[PDB]
Amino acid sequence: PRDAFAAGMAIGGSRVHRMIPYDENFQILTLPTTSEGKAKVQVGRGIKINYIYYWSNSFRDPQIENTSV
Amino acid sequence: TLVVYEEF
């Protein structure tokens, strides 16, 4: 199978453009989410996901406060 | 031995 794989990707091209780099972006892209997709940022509490509340420093900015992210 | 305290 490795020889067939090598021969095929040599004949059919490596297709480097379609490569997906295993980095943090892919890490957060593979992660799942809730049904709605976005949650509200309640002041002083954060975002409610699966019965728990999550907070971040940037949430202190009122621009993203009381809005869906 | 039991100590005895005072008023405050």
Partner: protein, 343 residues
């Protein structure tokens, strides 16, 4: 002497009850926090807040009415030459009637309580709606806005120059609306305390435990006093509890002294090491006995005035919650040394 005065036996029941009312014990925790509090009021070095956490029953209120009277006595020679000065100021925070705490009522109460001096003092505020009447009672027009009331309060506090402003029931500040930051309230208090130059001593239960170390400025300028209930694990705390039980039993005004030390486990169970609850229990039992005019206090009169088990479960839940927070450990010191590039 070392016991309750003999002549109290000759006096009627109400005098014995009153004597029991005015008797304050001196346990090692009380004297230690007394020394620490006296030192920090005498010398804060820039600190603006003094938090005194404690249980419901260890003696916070009392702790102050003692510190208030002592500082008044200390400042009396200082008031002999300098006038228009109040030694201490103390108010109790008021629980709101709505979803959010009322600051306007707080400023109104503080201006009412602080300004009850001799009429000769005629300090003038910066607000027209607040007036000292001929009778002497400060009247605040309902339309005066809060910031207004506060400007005044600052002027009065900088003219009077006290040493400490006591606020009982500090956790009532935490009755904020859903979403109101719990740091903005402390920020308002710190702004009040930073330009007047007066320490703010907050007294409250372990709920006030939600007002600690919110910011670096709110942490450096804060002094944390903890008033712990007596623990059964520590042998020395057990000795202190037995000693205070013996002292209360001995000064208990009656012709016969029941052995309250024997039922020390029952006392600990129904007071959780809180001396104020123990005094309340002893007061109820003494009132029962003196109503029945008996000379011996039994376990039955101890039970008929005993708190329910669910109550003690709830208070002990609160106390464990509070005592887990301010725990200190050598590991804390060492990891703070490590994170500082000191280990």
């Amino acid at each position: 002497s070392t016991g309750f005065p003999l002549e109290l036996l000759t006096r009627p029941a109400t005098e014995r009850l009153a004597y029991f009312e005015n008797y304050t014990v001196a346990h090692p925790r009380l004297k230690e926090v007394y020394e620490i509090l006296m030192r920090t009021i005498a010398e804060p070095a820039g600190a603006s807040f003094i938090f005194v956490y404690g249980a419901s029953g260890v003696g916070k209120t009392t702790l102050r009415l003692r510190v208030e009277q002592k500082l008044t006595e200390l400042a009396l020679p200082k008031l002999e030459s300098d006038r228009a000065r109040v030694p201490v100021v103390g108010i109790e925070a008021i629980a709101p009637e709505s979803r959010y705490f009322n600051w306007k009522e707080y400023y109104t109460r503080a201006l009412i309580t602080l300004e009850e001096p001799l009429i000769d003092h005629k300090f003038d505020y910066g607000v027209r709606g607040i007036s000292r009447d001929n009778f002497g009672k400060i009247n605040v027009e309902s339309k005066v806005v809060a910031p207004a009331l506060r400007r005044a309060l600052e002027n009065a506090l900088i003219h009077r120059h006290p040493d400490v402003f006591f606020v009982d029931e500090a956790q009532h500040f935490g009755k904020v609306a859903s979403g109101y930051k719990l740091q903005d309230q402390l920020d308002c208090l710190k702004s009040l305390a930073n330009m007047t130059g007066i320490l703010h001593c907050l007294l409250g239960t372990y709920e006030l435990l939600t007002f600690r170390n919110l910011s670096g400025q709110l942490s450096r300028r804060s002094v944390d006093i903890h008033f712990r209930r007596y623990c059964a694990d520590s042998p020395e705390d057990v000795q202190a509890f037995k000693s205070v039980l013996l002292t209360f039993q001995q000064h208990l005004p009656l012709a016969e002294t029941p052995n309250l030390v024997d039922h020390w486990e029952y006392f600990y169970e129904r007071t959780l090491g809180c001396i104020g609850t123990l005094k309340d229990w002893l007061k109820r039992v003494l009132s029962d006995a003196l109503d029945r005019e008996a000379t011996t206090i039994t376990l039955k009169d101890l039970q008929k005035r005993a708190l329910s088990v669910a109550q003690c479960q709830k208070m002990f839940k609160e106390i464990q919650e509070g005592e887990r927070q301010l725990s200190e450990t050598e590991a804390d010191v060492q990891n703070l040394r490590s994170a500082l590039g000191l280990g």
